[PDB]
Amino acid sequence: TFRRLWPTIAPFKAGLIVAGVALILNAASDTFMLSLLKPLLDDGFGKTDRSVLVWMPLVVIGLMILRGITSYVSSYCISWVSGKVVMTMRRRLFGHMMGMPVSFFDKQSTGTLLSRITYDSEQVASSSSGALITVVREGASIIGLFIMMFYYSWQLSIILIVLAPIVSIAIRVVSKRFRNISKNMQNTMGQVTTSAEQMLKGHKEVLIFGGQEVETKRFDKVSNRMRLQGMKMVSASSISDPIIQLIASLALAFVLYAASFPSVMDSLTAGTITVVFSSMIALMRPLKSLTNVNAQFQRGMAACQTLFTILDSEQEKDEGKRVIERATGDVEFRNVTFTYPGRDVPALRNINLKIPAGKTVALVGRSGSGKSTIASLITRFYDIDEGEILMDGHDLREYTLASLRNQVALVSQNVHLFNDTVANNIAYARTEQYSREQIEEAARMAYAMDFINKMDNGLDTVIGENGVLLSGGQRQRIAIARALLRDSPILILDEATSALDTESERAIQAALDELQKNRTSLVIAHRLSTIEKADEIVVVEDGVIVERGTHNDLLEHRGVYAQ
Amino acid sequence: TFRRLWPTIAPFKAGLIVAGVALILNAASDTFMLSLLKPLLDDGFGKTDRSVLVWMPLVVIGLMILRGITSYVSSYCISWVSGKVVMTMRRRLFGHMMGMPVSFFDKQSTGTLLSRITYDSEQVASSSSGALITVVREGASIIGLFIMMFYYSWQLSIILIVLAPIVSIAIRVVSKRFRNISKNMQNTMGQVTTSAEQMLKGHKEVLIFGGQEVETKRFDKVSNRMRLQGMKMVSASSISDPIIQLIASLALAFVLYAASFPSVMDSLTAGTITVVFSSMIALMRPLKSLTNVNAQFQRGMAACQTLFTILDSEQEKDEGKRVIERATGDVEFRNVTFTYPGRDVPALRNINLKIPAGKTVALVGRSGSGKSTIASLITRFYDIDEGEILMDGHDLREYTLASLRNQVALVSQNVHLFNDTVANNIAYARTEQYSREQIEEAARMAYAMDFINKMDNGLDTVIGENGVLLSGGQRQRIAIARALLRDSPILILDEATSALDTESERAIQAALDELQKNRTSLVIAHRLSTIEKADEIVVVEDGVIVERGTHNDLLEHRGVYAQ
């Protein structure tokens, strides 16, 4: 439980303990000020004297600068735990996310990963700090006030300490009822959310038929059902606080009825009774929070448990011990039967495809099956279920992923561009081993000149997100340069659109001639240039091996592009 | 803006005024209860022994059950306005949503309209009702407390009333600094969120390219900038309350300094000063919240202003006063040029396509140009930018939308399914005209579907977002019946997937054929069978009309395609 989050807290005890002391001093400052009451009313206004009257204002100002400076110190030095553990958990999650398989990213979890990184890791230490600020402050206030009563009037404290548990458990039971009701109606609010969003999703279809009068009549019945439970939210929550205050007020009436009604119980003067009868009311926040704390501690810890399910999810299983500077040998597939995680119909059964060195393979991309998975299986995005994949004799899994993944460079129109500059995203993890001259030849040979060659600014310009919103016509070319900065024995080409380009198609033929005159390439095809200019055209797709041949043998039998 | 919102709240004065009276009674309860101190400490434990004290705890518990009653009543009867200006706004927005065209849905907005219905309308009357739970309560507590000051000690309440504005504007300036600082870090929060979502969304091209350690090092800098910003934010938030409380403490010291002079004594006894100086503490939340009211009244009103920007927009321009019961005449397009809202390159250039009666026109969506924009033009999803659209020799605008949208019926592999019964789904907004015998006639005519027959619940079973989810090979089938419940002169037939299922493909083709015995059809289809047995065949892409011919002249002017 908390024992696994404790090591993260461990190097910040120097902040946590100081926050705890700054808050117990806050509670003591909110109790000595009440202790000032008895002299003020007893030795002052009752028994006429001015020493207490003159000394009380400066004492109050002193105690309030103590209240303020210690509250500020607690708030600052708890954010050195709630702001330096949020950072560490976010960074540990992020480091445990970039080395986890893209299979997790493959719609097993949607874009709520950003929420789990930011909002959840904020809430963990915003609610587990709210269950330490609360615990230390309020459990200091409780003990301080109970110490206050004993020295001043233990005749009322001996009644209060036995009145405590009923008022303490009443709030707990009513709060449990409130939380159970909220958990019950979670389904109702989820249902109205689904009913509201699905019409906005299917606006087209609902508009297609006669009219939306029936649709809004249907919406009325869910609006009413949400109204009737929005009523019940307040009818269940605003019954808790009045009932708690009424029980606490019965206790208040009990202690007040414990007056000098017994003539023996005449030890209380006005100052003696005012402090106790006031701490009675000061006891509302702490005894409430001491029982509402467990509703937030175990909830922040539930969020941390979700983050720990994320974190304990295994990284990519990296066990290869091989590195290759230039994959000279042939790359080929051998009876690679593969199923995506979460799919039953195999998108790729046994395939014996081979990619000879210095030659290209073009897969026609209209079918939409066995297109991206053949690309992915070379990069160890999704590991092969049953099969063998060989580069330079040896199997694919013998290499470490850090060594392998540089041996393949994917190029696509739908290409992710980094927040950094154009001189950095071109050479991500390659600023160290490649210099500005290399970036310049990469830009020159890749024909990125229409956007970035002419200016004397040269290399570094803002091009990414929150930049100039680079167009596709040069996203393709900067991806081409990203691949064409060498150390790319194998390339994967998408050509998803194959649409109007201002000689960017000529640029990618230049890329073809430049970086597979001696290197390999596996391509998915959507253009007549891909159909015509290709050493070996393989239209193997639909999870089946059907054709294999050059331009003369584009067809096994009459079919697609078999002219 | 509140002037325009108030008509919605007009018929709920009977709830709002009662809530106001309940809360002002709550404030008066919290004020008379504090006033009760002076009889207590001035005639019980103090000078006179016991005449007041007998009924004091009984009056206390009585006035606390009054407090509880007037809190619960004001919560319920303010929920009766927060759930009848939320429900009415939701029902009015939704009614002003299904009439608002698809141009709003596709590009001018996204799926956050569910949020705009739910959260952005809950937070209108969860903040404008918080600026009346707060206003009346905390402006009644202040007024009652001030009247109680004047009655009990008028010789030092004037000090309070002249001291009020300093502590009243100190809170305002401190909160202004707080809230102006608050919006400054929103940029940094957005920046780190953008970094964490874009680099995480770019798992592809951040992993294949080896940028793992460098990506983590980049993330560390933004984590540092988030931690430092959180430090600054918490410091700016927690400087506020201590210094406000210290100014309030200086006021406490001021009243105590006044309490020491010999002019205010002899009109200030132990009970009187006790109650008077307890009101000093009682007044903390009232005067603190009465200045933070405008931080929520004009914020919920701003949210309502966003809702009013949504609401005060324009419906589709339904400029038509003609009805049609059977679109017997030809549906033709002449020199139609159209641009999507938000796109400069025309997706549809000049067109002269004609859809004759009793003959089908087919298309292939490999190019993905002018395939949906022509489908979504018969339905008036996007209004004609320029040209002529002919319906029985009359222009499109002659018919009204309600009359026209019956005359078309789209058929698609992917399609929206309502969360309703099957008899309502097949006949949505048509249950009044067609009954269960006709529904089962349609099912009998829908040969391919077997899940709803011979099980005897398939007249009113559940298939939508609940019950049995419908697979893709059967959403198509039920859509066939939805279109094949007659009154469908015009057909749009999409084929998002070229794949075929046993007898499902033949079933949709048979549906097309019996919808070609009479009526017309415009078809998008990657499959070649429909064009093989099409009456008229076209390949119109790239906007400009290029083709007009039967199978003998399949693709004449297209060029290098050649069937």
Ligand SMILES: CCCCCCCCCCCCCC(=O)O[C@H](CCCCCCCCCCC)CC(=O)O[C@@H]1[C@@H](NC(=O)C[C@@H](CCCCCCCCCCC)OC(=O)CCCCCCCCCCC)[C@H](OC[C@H]2O[C@H](OP(=O)(O)O)[C@H](NC(=O)C[C@H](O)CCCCCCCCCCC)[C@@H](OC(=O)C[C@H](O)CCCCCCCCCCC)[C@@H]2O)O[C@H](CO[C@]2(C(=O)O)C[C@@H](O[C@]3(C(=O)O)C[C@@H](O)[C@@H](O)[C@@H]([C@H](O)CO)O3)[C@@H](O)[C@@H]([C@H](O)CO)O2)[C@H]1OP(=O)(O)O
């Ligand atoms: C013109 C210019 C003049 C200005 C100059 C002024 C000069 C003053 C100088 C400085 C003074 C110090 C002020 C201060 O600064 O000191 C306060 C505490 C004060 C302690 C300091 C002692 C000073 C002694 C001086 C001695 C010097 C020698 C700040 C703080 O220590 O904690 C503060 C909070 N907690 C309290 O316990 C004080 C709270 C109670 C504490 C009172 C102690 C005072 C005793 C002194 C008496 C001596 C005088 C002679 O009352 C108060 O305010 C105080 C009002 C006092 C009323 C008089 C009572 C005594 C009279 C009779 C006895 C003789 C306070 O929230 C309490 C509110 O709850 C009720 O309403 P609701 O619940 O909302 O409905 C009260 N309604 C009532 O009817 C109460 C009524 O009495 C009930 C009586 C019945 C119950 C008795 C039980 C019996 C027990 C037996 C069982 C064993 C309402 O009381 C009011 O105003 C109205 C007022 O009572 C009317 C009184 C009506 C009835 C009177 C009965 C007696 C009369 C009978 C006679 C016959 C009160 O406002 O708000 C801030 C902000 O906190 C959050 C935050 O954490 O940030 C807290 C959050 O509140 C909650 C929440 O609802 O969610 C609720 C909390 O319970 C808690 O759950 C926290 C939680 O921890 C998570 O947050 O959340 C929320 O407020 C939020 C902001 O709203 C927006 O964010 O801010 C906190 O600060 P922070 O935490 O430090 O930041």
